[PDB]
Amino acid sequence: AFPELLDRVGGRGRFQLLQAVALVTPILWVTTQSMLENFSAAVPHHRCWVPLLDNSGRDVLLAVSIPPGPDQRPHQCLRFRQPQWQLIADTEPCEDGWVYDHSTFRSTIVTTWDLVCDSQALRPMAQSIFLAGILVGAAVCGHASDRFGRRRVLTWSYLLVSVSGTIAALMPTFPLYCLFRFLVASAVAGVMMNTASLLMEWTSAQAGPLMMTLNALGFSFGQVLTGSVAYGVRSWRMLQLAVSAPFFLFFVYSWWLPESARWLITVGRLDQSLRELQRVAAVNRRKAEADTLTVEVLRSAMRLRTFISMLCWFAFGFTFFGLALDLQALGSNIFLLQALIGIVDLPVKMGSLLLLSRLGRRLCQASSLVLPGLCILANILVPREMGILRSSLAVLGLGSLGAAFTCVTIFSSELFPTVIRMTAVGLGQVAARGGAMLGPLVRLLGVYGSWLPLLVYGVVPVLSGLAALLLP
Ligand SMILES: CCc1oc2ccccc2c1C(=O)c1cc(Br)c(O)c(Br)c1
């Protein structure tokens, strides 16, 4: 009978707008802490330390000291034992440390801990560990927000994000940085599920479109907050602090938001629920029907399609979270991409949805997965002679893969007996954050050709979208 009390107490109005505003803002920084592994773990050009150069014809010394490399560059992993002055066979690996290029980044984690050359597989694992953390944090938090409430967990998760982000920026060794990022990811997943649920519960029956639109449209401007804070702070020890600092201020003000009124009824905390409903009504200024609440009323109140959705969610999660955490290979000028993956997400999603829904729901579902797969697949074909075309396709693709996140939820998830969609939307997400941990692991296949990662990242969504045409 809870919708009746909600209608008696409000619906739209004022409070349901300030709550949405105060809950949407953390989503931007939540995005910031997930795509931050693109400007923090950046790999600049690295060469081998030499006694002749870099103190104890500059080009002549560079040519005589380092053997030439395959890709029209000096070798990044080998050096001459002695100066081969015959150049107007016998080589050893770098043992005096590397020298890096300090022209766009001052200090990345790679520069600090030498994650190059033989120790290359370490870099694509710090993101898999992060996503695994997200999964294990979104699994536990489910059976946590039922014995602790729903508002307290959000505040403690804000505090945990703040503390873990601050601590992870002052570690002296790699494994501690891997572990504290794991904790950060778990807390971030908890924040994102609790915020979604809190936005869900307090709203009326019209929670379907508006709130789920606001959550996504929040992630988009998010990308543009990374782009920006980056252009500003370049180092890596001063970036994690500058990103995790706002969460403490968020926790400080999160102590006043009223707790969800539906959970309080089912556990027997009637008096606090009455107080929360009364304060919500007072905020909403609809203090006319609040008199009727005299406790007694609240006392009385107290298979093929599923598989197709699973594959669609899995394909969406795998390609995006494995080709968007490597934008240094999709082009150049990183502080422009990871900053245009957003202004090309909102017009594109709106226009594509509006145009393709009238054709049909299944046509819209199919057209949103084959298109970006083909777009990404075409990227390897075009040579590097024209940069603008080399970089244009990826933005539109990764942009349209974002369109699945919305299209496959507010237009999909009805492919079932149609009782309530909330028992299917959650089931889809387990595969997304359970295939992104199987994401950047594909980038570990840089050896044995460099085109295979892009080929896989393009073919998998293509096959998923094409098989989606086999619904009957
Ligand atoms: C543009 C689409 C999009 O952009 C992001 C940027 C940062 C974090 C999540 C997302 C995101 C998601 O839809 C999403 C949400 C959750 Br929850 C996940 O576990 C995974 Br994987 C992906």
Name the nearest CA neighbour of 155 among 242, 218, 244, 247: 247
Angle (CA) 19 343 409, round 5°: 60
Question: Phi and psi dihedrals of 150, rounded to 5?
Answer: -130, -20
Decide whether any atom of ligand 1 lies within 6 Å of the 134 Cβ.
yes
Helical residues (DSSP H) of 97-150, grouped into ranges? 109-113, 126-140
Query: Residue 411 has what DSSP assignment?
Result: I
In the chain, the amino acid numbered 1 is A
> For 101-136, b where at least 16 C-beta lie within 10 A, e where not — what string?
eeeebebbbbbeebbbeeeeebbbebbbebbbbbbb
For the structural domain made of 303-472, what CATH number should be given? 1.20.1250.20
301 to 145, 265, 270, 286: CA distances (angstroms): 21, 8, 11, 21
Beta bridge partners of 99: 47
Pick the residue whose CA is nearest to atom 13 on ligand 1.
405
Spatial distance between the Cα atoms of 1 and 302, rounded to a whole number of angstroms: 9
**Residue having the nearest C-alpha atom to atom 20 of ligand 1:** 433
Which H/E stretch holds residue 60?
helix 58-65
CB 9 within 8 A of CB 286: yes
Report the amino acid identity of residue 86: Q
How many H-runs (helices) and E-runs (strands) does the chain carry?
Answer: 18, 4
Among residues 427, 457, 460, 438, which one has the least CA distance to residue 131? 438
Whose Cα sits closest to atom 8 in ligand 1?
31
Give whole-number Cα distances, 43 to 117, 224, 257, 293, in Å. Answer: 11, 22, 43, 62
Q: Does ligand 1 come within 6 angstroms of the Cβ of 219?
A: yes
CA-closest candidate to residue 223, choices 417, 39, 49: 39
Tokens describing residue 322: 């494995």
Domain with CATH 1.20.1250.20 in the chain: 1-40+117-302, 303-472
Ligand 1, pocket-test mutation among 29, 219, 406, most atoms within 8 A of CB: 219
For ligand 1, atom 21: residue with the closest CA: 433
Please work out whether the CB of residue 425 comes within 6 Å of at least one atom of ligand 1.
Answer: no
Three-state secondary structure of 204-269: CCCHHHHHHHHHHHHHHHHHHHHHHHHHHCCCCHHHHHHHHHHHHHHHHHCCCCCCCHHHHHHHCC
Q: Bridge partners of 48?
A: 98
Among residues 298, 251, 276, 203, which one has the least CA distance to residue 12?
Answer: 203
Q: Are 2 and 198 in contact (CB under 8 A)?
A: no
Query: Looking at residue 409, what DSSP letter applies?
Result: I
Listed in sequence order, the residues at least 6 apart from 311 whose beta carbon sits closer than 8 Å to its beta carbon are 464, 467, 468
Ligand 1 centroid, distance to 220 Cα (angstroms): 10
3-state secondary structure of 69: coil
Q: 77 near 120, Cβ under 8 Å?
A: no
For the Cβ of 50 lying below 6 angstroms from any atom of ligand 1, the answer is no
The residue type of 172 is P
Q: Which of 179, 130, 180 is nearest to 160 (CA)?
A: 180
Q: Take atom 1 of ligand 1 and give the residue whose Cα is closest.
A: 402
Phi, psi of 282 (to 5 degrees): -65, -40
Q: Do 123 and 43 meet the contact criterion of CB atoms below 8 Å apart?
A: yes
Q: How far apart are CA 258 and CA 251, in angstroms?
A: 14
Amino acid at position 319, single letter: T
How far apart are the C-alpha atoms of 164 and 168, rounded to whole Å?
Answer: 6
What's the chain's Rg over C-alpha atoms? 26
By what method was this entry solved?
cryo-EM
Alpha-carbon span 292 to 295, nearest angstrom: 9
DSSP conformation class of 112 = H
Cα 51 from Cα 26, distance rounded (Å): 50
At a CB cut-off of 8 Å and minimum separation 6, what does 382 contact?
A: 389, 390, 393
Q: With a 6 A CB cut-off, is 318 part of the ligand 1 pocket?
A: no
Burial label for 419, CB within 10 Å (0-12, 13-18, 19+), is exposed
Is any atom of ligand 1 closer than 6 Å to the C-beta of 409? no
Q: Is the dihedral of CA 115, 119, 122, 123 positive or negative?
A: positive
CA 438 vs CA 241, 242, 457: distances in Å: 29, 30, 12
CA distances from 163 to 10, 150, 159, 246, 314 (A): 37, 21, 6, 11, 32
* Helix-helix angle 15-32:174-202, to 10 degrees: 160
- What are the residues whose beta carbons fall under 8 Å from the beta carbon of 20, sequence distance 6 or more? 199, 211, 214
Resolution (A): 3.5
Ligand 1 centroid – CA 128 distance (Å): 14
Residue (of 471, 177, 155, 194) closest to 311 by Cα position: 471
Q: Over the range 231-256, which residues count as b (16 or more CB within 10 Å of their CB) and which as e?
A: eebbebbebbebbbebbeebbeebee
For helices 237-253 and 151-168, angle between their N-to-C axes, nearest 10 degrees: 160
Is residue 13 exposed (0-12), middle (13-18) or buried (19+ Cβ within 10 Å)?
Answer: middle
The number of the ligand 1 atom at minimal distance from the alpha carbon of 35 is 7
Q: Which CATH superfamily is domain 1-40+117-302 in?
A: MFS general substrate transporter like domains (1.20.1250.20)
CA distance 280 to 146: 22
- Distance separating alpha carbons of residues 300 and 130, to the nearest angstrom: 46
**What are the CA-CA distances from residue 65 to residues 71, 79, 81, 298 (Å)?**
18, 7, 9, 82
- Which residue reads 């990183």 in tokens? 334
Chain centre to alpha carbon of residue 205: 29
The structure tokens 């997200």 sit at 134
Query: Residue 433 C-alpha to ligand 1 middle, in angstroms?
Result: 9
Query: Tokens representing 133?
Result: 């953390």
